[PDB]
């Protein structure tokens, strides 16, 4: 396992292209019918920042949950006593790019539980192995991970 480099993205194509996570199907709000397609993740081994105090960080698509749960296991295996941490999941605060996959519950920003920035490259590589459709070493402070839509 080789850590991703700073600003590296895998696969080597734009996020919203067919070979990666594919196209934006539009914003999901708390009002929407599509809100019901979002399910909360209560994995006791994932730390959710939830600075919003709304539980929004836990809300994501079924595929997002599945890859996230896989990555939870591989993080605990990589570093004893450390857990996967989500800073953002589904977003209703407009805290992302203009048509962010966060707005439809298809992306997570992640760190390790210890917020050790030196682990983040390897954390990104674990996200690729866990089967995220697109992984991007987006900032010094986080890894952005996204998935294809259910449809």
């Amino acid at each position, epitope marked *: 396992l080789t850590p991703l480099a*700073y600003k590296q993205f895998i696969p080597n194509v734009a996020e919203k292209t067919l070979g990666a996570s594919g196209r934006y199907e539009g914003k999901i709000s708390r009002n929407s019918e599509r809100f019901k397609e979002l399910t909360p993740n209560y994995n006791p081994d994932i730390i959710f920042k939830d*600075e919003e105090n709304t539980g929004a960080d836990r809300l994501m698509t079924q595929r997002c949950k599945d890859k996230l749960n896989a990555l939870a296991i591989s993080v605990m295996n990589q570093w004893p006593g450390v857990k996967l941490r989500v800073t953002e999941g589904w977003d209703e605060d*407009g805290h*992302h*790019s*203009e048509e962010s996959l966060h707005y439809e519950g298809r992306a997570v920003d992640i760190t390790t539980s210890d917020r050790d920035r030196s682990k983040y490259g390897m954390l990104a590589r674990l996200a690729v192995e866990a089967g995220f459709d697109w992984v991007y070493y987006e*900032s*010094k402070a986080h890894i952005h991970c996204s998935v294809k839509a259910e449809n």
Partner: antibody
Amino acid sequence: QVQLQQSGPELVRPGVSVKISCKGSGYTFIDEALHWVKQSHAESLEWIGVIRPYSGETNYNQKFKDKATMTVDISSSTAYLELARLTSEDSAIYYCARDWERGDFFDYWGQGTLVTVSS
Amino acid sequence: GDIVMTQTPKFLLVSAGDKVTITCKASQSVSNDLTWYQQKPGQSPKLLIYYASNRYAGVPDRFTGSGYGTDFTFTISTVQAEDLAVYFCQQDYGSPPTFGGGTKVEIKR
């Protein structure tokens, strides 16, 4: 609702030290890092350093390493900047500023503390 | 070598409705780790743009940013009276983070 409240203006002689404060409210204090930024006519904005209250870790700009000490009191949601062996080059507005775990840039800024170093 | 941000112009006089174009050039590439702030008179800086082109929540459409590497562009498409401020770029690709010297935007009426 997020606010950073800084301490008042300071007059201090050259060669004396001064300690200024920044109190955070409307968020969980250990959720975000706190940065210190100097604003002077001569040098515009300069990053002094960062303190992570969750771990107590500090990173200093090497230009301020001998000048500046950063500390936090979690119980009072307050960060402190201590500046030592001051000269008139140290006269400036000092800001505290929060990041939001997106990178080392700042969504919330204190109102600023004016420090005048003078005899 | 710390990264040096050179901002131009230093001053702009502009009428309401007109375009503002501000340039930030880094001494070496900073990827897209480039942030634009607005500092209105007597206030603290306010975040408008981060990752070179992303508007912060609630920032109006007239504010945009572009660039990757050394050369960054900040634009107010149609400046308004309340946009008078000093605008500053900041890189955080390299340690320490470093700021441009600012561009004062003054209104012609």
